Amino acid sequence: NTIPIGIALAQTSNVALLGQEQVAGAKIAEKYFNDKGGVNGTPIKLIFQDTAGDEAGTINAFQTLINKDKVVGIVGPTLSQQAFSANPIAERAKVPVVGPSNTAKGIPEIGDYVARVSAPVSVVAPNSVKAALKQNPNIKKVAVFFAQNDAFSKSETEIFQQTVKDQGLELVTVQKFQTTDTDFQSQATNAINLKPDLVIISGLAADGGNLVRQLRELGYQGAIIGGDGLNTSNVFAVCKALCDGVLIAQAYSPEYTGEINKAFRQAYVDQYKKEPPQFSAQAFAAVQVYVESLKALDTKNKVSKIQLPELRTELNKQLLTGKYNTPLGEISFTPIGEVVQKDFYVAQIKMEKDGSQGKFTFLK
Ligand code: MET
Ligand SMILES: [Mg+2]
Fold first, then answer.
1. Are 175 and 221 in contact (CB under 8 A)?
2. What CATH code is carried by the domain that includes residue 333?
């Protein structure tokens, strides 16, 4: 006998460039917690249902997990764009959802069954602008790009734009694109002609990487900040050597000294031969929230005897009250399921000159 937890992430489509790291983190969590006896002796079982890259796919994944797989709760989805459409399905069904990396404004507000372990754009994004200004205090003109078809990108770019204004910088242009675009010559040239010292991009991985590369191809030599959608080594293949120098804020640091992060990091590093990326840590933390909440609930009210609808409701109630020592640091939730997290960072992409390999270097 095992306790089913649903994992609804992008395992196909271009969104899987972001989902990949999350699936990896979730699998590491499953082994980590089951090796510790699962929920008071009862193993958990992660049940994966691919969301693909759109809303319909996420709705279908949630409904399958809820109705066929009878999961006690869901971790997912990958994108805020997907969460806004699909999470209300779980809310109405009274099934908890914990978002691992949905950072758009308004996610926890979707309902009483929606929480997230991922700090939102308003708290993560401004640090990368401050970091850019530290590396070049003479930055004055800023060009901003964003994917207008993506909910998170629209949310993130508003934060970036306000931060630019508050830092006393000149916003010379705001350019729009679609996440499905591969070509950005017109927008990139429009920005370059305005001589920005800093470019900020809010998109996803393939699009963001393509835009970074094209900006460099077209001769742009200034600073570049990428938003959370570019926060994966999967961009390295796209912009290659031209990814070098891109600043990306982080809601996770491998060097954080919590015991579980040490164990998570070591488990990750030993397998993947590189530092755990943010999306992997965040997915681990989401599974952790479910395991530790299930343990706490089971101790007070043996879960093997609770019928599924009540189990879901009590698990949701429980997880909202918990304090968790996760790879992300010590976290908890507000009464509406917003994450409470103290520490944030900025990393910078460092490419090898050949362009075949790179890493994220954390700024001190
Ligand atoms: C794992 S990709 C997440 C991208 C962005 N944080 C969003 O909310 O969609
Ligand atoms: Mg909520």
1. no
2. 3.40.50.2300
Cα(337)–Cα(108) distance, rounded to whole angstroms? 5
| Whether the CB of 202 sits within 6 Å of ligand 1 | no
Phi/psi of residue 300, nearest 5 degrees: -90, -25
E strands in the chain: 3-7, 44-48, 74-75, 97-99, 114-116, 141-147, 170-177, 198-202, 223-226, 247-250, 323-326, 329-333, 339-340, 345-351, 358-362
Distance 332 CA to ligand 2 centre (A): 13
Q: Which of 11, 18, 87, 339 to mutate to test the pocket of ligand 1 (most atoms within 8 A of CB)?
A: 18
Looking at the structure, do residues 166 and 315 belong to the same domain, yes or no? no
| Ligand that lies nearest to the alpha carbon of residue 159, given by its number in the listed order | 1
Q: What value, to the nearest 5°, has the Cα angle with vertex 361 and ends 260 and 8? A: 50
CA distance 238 to 51: 24
Q: How was this structure determined?
A: X-ray
Provide the residue range defining the domain that includes 134: 121-253+343-364
Owner of token pair 């700024």: 363
Which residue's alpha carbon is at the smallest distance from atom 4 of ligand 1? 229
